[model samples]
Target: PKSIFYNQVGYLISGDKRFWIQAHEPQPFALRTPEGQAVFAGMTKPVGGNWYVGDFTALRVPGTYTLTVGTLEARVVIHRRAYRDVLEAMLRFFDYQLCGVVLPEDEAGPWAHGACHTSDAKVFGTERALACPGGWHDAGDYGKYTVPAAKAVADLLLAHEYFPAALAHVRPMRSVHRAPHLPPALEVAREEIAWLLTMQDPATGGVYHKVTTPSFPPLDTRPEDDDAPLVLSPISYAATATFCAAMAHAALVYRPFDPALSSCCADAARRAYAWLGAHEMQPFHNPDGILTGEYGDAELRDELLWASCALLRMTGDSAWARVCEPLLDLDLPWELGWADVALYGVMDYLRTPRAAVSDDVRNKVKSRLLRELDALAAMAESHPFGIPMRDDDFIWGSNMVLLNRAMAFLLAEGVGVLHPAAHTVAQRAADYLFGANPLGQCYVTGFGQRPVRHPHHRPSVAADVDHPVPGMVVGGPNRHLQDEIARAQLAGRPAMEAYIDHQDSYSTNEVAVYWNSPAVFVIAALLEAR
Candidate 1:
């Protein structure tokens, strides 16, 4: 069916509102009420390559409206709190991913589940067992990975730090969480942080890479139904360093809310840093029988950089800056991904007290970050959707890539790295995530006309419901077509059009905690700006 591509979740009344169509020539467009009275009219302008964008940003009234461009008609909404419900749902997705908790029907609705992965896990190549439970299932599998968990926790903490007021209005699954309730982001992130603390070895301070079964269960298996024996992967430098960074970040953010947990995290971070200093920077390999996801990376300097800079920010110590500065000088790709996390370190260093860090290095870092943002803004300028992404960027978890870039723009504002395009890029990124894409698909579940009905998540698959859990963001299009279904169904398709809303399209349709973490941050930033 031919349809006008717009944000299916609705638009902020005071924000930019535009719809996209595949038209070669300028066309007339109108927004009408349900009673067929025209409320606003506009002319579509060519953005690029057969793409015309209808700008109705002038329509400020809050209500439901029908948008028409030529023969295509679609429903649109404008509201003061347009993104509030979706933001709350996005945050609650984390709670739904909780490992050792039973989600009651009242709280989780149709997606409620029994406690899962609750048993002790045996240390890799060791006879001794340890209870490494709680935290979120990594992606569609029942694995709890340390490296990605760090990224997820850091994004949430940053969201809380940056937009507390915007996040305050969101309500996650509160009954399962501890009280007195913290802000929305913090409240949800606290569970992951608590579980992360458990990943640290008390004896050596080294963190486990991941905890998972020997192999993935069948796709239709419920959380509690998969009773496979859990195994803890061996400790590695990447996990320890990333864990240190996240724990240090949590130490700072949670200090005001949960002092006891904050102190524990601070001490744990210091110990993990100590372990990192003692150990060699080695990549983690999956043990012989382990068939779970291997989030392996050869580059370890970015992890070290993030850990040191996070320590510097948490402690305000110049010694950590000394460690961080040298690592920053290395040619590392400064990204917010699970693999390359130097940008997180960059933000941490820039956000640190001026007196604690070297002015020269700080200036260099700031200049580099601004240059990166400018490059991203340039990409946004050329792209029809106006998001800071290229065709190749639509790889696995591309939504995270888009959201992280949006997050970087918002995060830059806190450290006084002002950019004219920051706000616009953020708004565009949110618009794209909510729908406004070539596919007319909302990457999130349960919140749009073309919402993801079937994610590759186990809980959603096992539950007896037609709709999957709301607010869980899928990986989006993958040009590589990593999964068999994606490869078979999406061959020769354009990168933006390579997505399928099928459970077997794990490469594109799978949901992840790290993915939602950035979505939570980006959405909160947009809502805050509104």
Candidate 2:
């Protein structure tokens, strides 16, 4: 097997916790620190298999120390600074993922290079290539998809909304001049939304589904080295709805900072909403011959529910609230994603304060949101590993589930319906990511006993560095073994034992811009909770 420890393991003194999963049955363990200090670790039976898991607390003092359990050992840092630094580092990761502009050598270092793909990209129907320069690389691939980008920006904006002061005083890490009034989270969101705005089809008001080459670029090559023909896909209802929803929410948050930009976002949002309204009969899927993930949904009313509620809050449109009212009665989604965005509708409906929505609807939405949260909490309680995640949850980008759970719980806390156990459970989920599982793997880069150093990021892969880019959250354990190498190396292994930290394993080890957004949200929320 590979190293049992994750690459990035972090602990907070007040929030100190560590975890590891076993390939076999339960056993007693303890964390032995460098000073020969020992802390007891408890093991639990597997929820679905004999795979045992241990949960232990880290050292209480502020210092760097090596922690060992049996022959397995890794470094651990206990401090509030780690939390703050990680928050800023996530911002730095997003900075590196930025498109359109030349990445400066000093700021980006070896990862730095002149801008590539500056020329106009081919529009889906016409031979014409429209100027589409900015946004973010969607994942391990260079493709920029609108649906995930919209969700990523919305979460970052929500992070600022939840904790306005988070990273507000963090020093400038990039060349862009951010308004002093805006938080660091908001500053990054502004940059992303700027590119996202360009993703909107000006003529149609519906957004382009994605901007990509015929295929992904070479793995070891830099962005400037790729010369593939870039083309913009056709408009998508889901993409347009997400764009409208995020922009409307942004318009409200940024109005006090830059009224002009806020107005632009609002205008774009309404225009897209109008486009959606006029074309209710049409649905969207990825066009044939494009094999990438479609992020498709047969039903988009949940997305519209969110876009409608956001517009309602920002513009005081009672008519739009009527659109949201019907969604409240529908099933609350399991998490926030391109497909399952109904939770956004639920949160906005409950939190929106313009009196556009009726009290009856507000009451019902709140009840539904809380009820949905309790169901998630109950699922968490049923897990023998103490993680809210289920066995099947160990898919690609599984860590997002933990982040989204923490985010949802925090939202419940914000709405005054947070369950008493919600915070404790949410904290444990965070702990699991930082090295609180059977493998003792810190799925984040540069923070654990054996933190992931080989993230499936092109820049990180190409960089001449000993470590992967800092602050990136690696997509954790994929039990399905989707790739040939993963299937060969990890197939039929225990569910939690299916992870291998190799760059070739994009399914298990990729780092992405969208993956880090909810992480920023969850960590900031936990820091405040402490």
Candidate 3:
């Protein structure tokens, strides 16, 4: 009678698996429809010490209901299109995370802010203030990292590209195509990319690794409220290479909307690409006292290869194609991230019609990429959770890893390498994100019955809402528990047991731009399914 109901959000989909958790002893439970009709409540089974799990998949009807566990009760809404609101909420969070702009009161309302961080950012190890405005605050923290920023923008753009019909609207208002305006996803990404463009050194065409303080700011402070000094971190070959690829992709994607902007992006991309080819390759290291994630890439081949692939597809340049051909034999990417982005190149190369690369070279890369997708599909089929992730996937950003694995399913579909069960597997991961996991808690804020309320984010911390900005995906369940805050929060818990919806646990509860991007891509892809 004294246990927390793990299934607080009570939302469910018709014909999908459903369960709830009991923090105390096993007890009989009852579910009631809005009309007070009682549905069968199943016997509870022991899952762990002081923890019991209950299954109630018997509630098959798509209607509002309440589940009563002795003294505990919660509302549940069941529907077929369970993800409709989730996608819209997820997209709206991007606006909440915006930086360097005066937020409109009506759009994000309470999360809106005055212009902040306008002080010229100092170049690390130097005395210069570079204009670093417009992208997103990188994570729950205030930093903006180019590697992750470009990757985030690229993923959102890819999501929009893959399902333009589905992802166009910020909400379910209307189709973007009919409105004759750029879609919501593209607008958010365009804002971030515009900021990322400023990260580039005009003299060198190299991108700064990040713009952040030596350490993170306090948890409860707002961006405009916190006047912490921001520094533009040093440039890296990896950052430059990713910049080249992302902008090139952006250039092509934006052509229909604005040819002049697309041309500008393409020109910038090629210039960056040239700089990368000529400059001595160097990885970025944070200045002394800086405690941010290094994101140091050792080899620049994957980054350059991806850029080359984008250039070839956009410009039909034989030289870019030749550079990409040799890199086709490198090991297949586990998943695309700041470190391994050759997959972006590979995916781009596969999707372009009338590709500029030699047919023979293209065919060889396609053969290899298709095989990798097949292997991923088989792995997903075998996994207990039906996610295409391995033992190594449970790292710091495991949620992103799960989302990225789901991205592979979409990529597979694009290339005809997909299995019929691919959508099933992808849907399971999506379900897991919403509330199908061990905790029986939704990772998104203001979602499900047990949506994240105390996410380790500053804006949410500062805001007065009962929930954080709706739709921001928390960096869920990291086994590593790198930070002291998370270590104490997890405290000898099993790797799988390393999560709780608390405000202090940044590793397990933080939200970020990169995390939401893949999630947006996955949900949009699912909505496209017939």
What TM-score would every model get versus the actual structure?
A: 0.98, 0.90, 0.86
Cα lDDT tens digits, model 2, 63-104, are: 666555455656656675557776777767787787767777
Give the candidate order by descending lDDT.
1, 3, 2
lDDT digits (tens) for residues 101-196 of candidate 3 = 777776666787877677788998889788888678888887778898878989999988888877765552121112225777886677787787
Ranking by TM-score: 1, 2, 3
Residue 92, candidate 3: alpha-carbon lDDT: 70
* Model 3 misplaced stretches (Cα beyond 4 Å): 1-62, 65-80, 171-181, 332-334, 359-361, 390-392, 464-466
Candidate 2, residue 403: lDDT: 79
Error of 3 at 484 (Å): 2.6
Q: What is every candidate's alpha-carbon RMSD to the true fold?
A: 1.1, 3.3, 4.6
lDDT of 1: 0.90
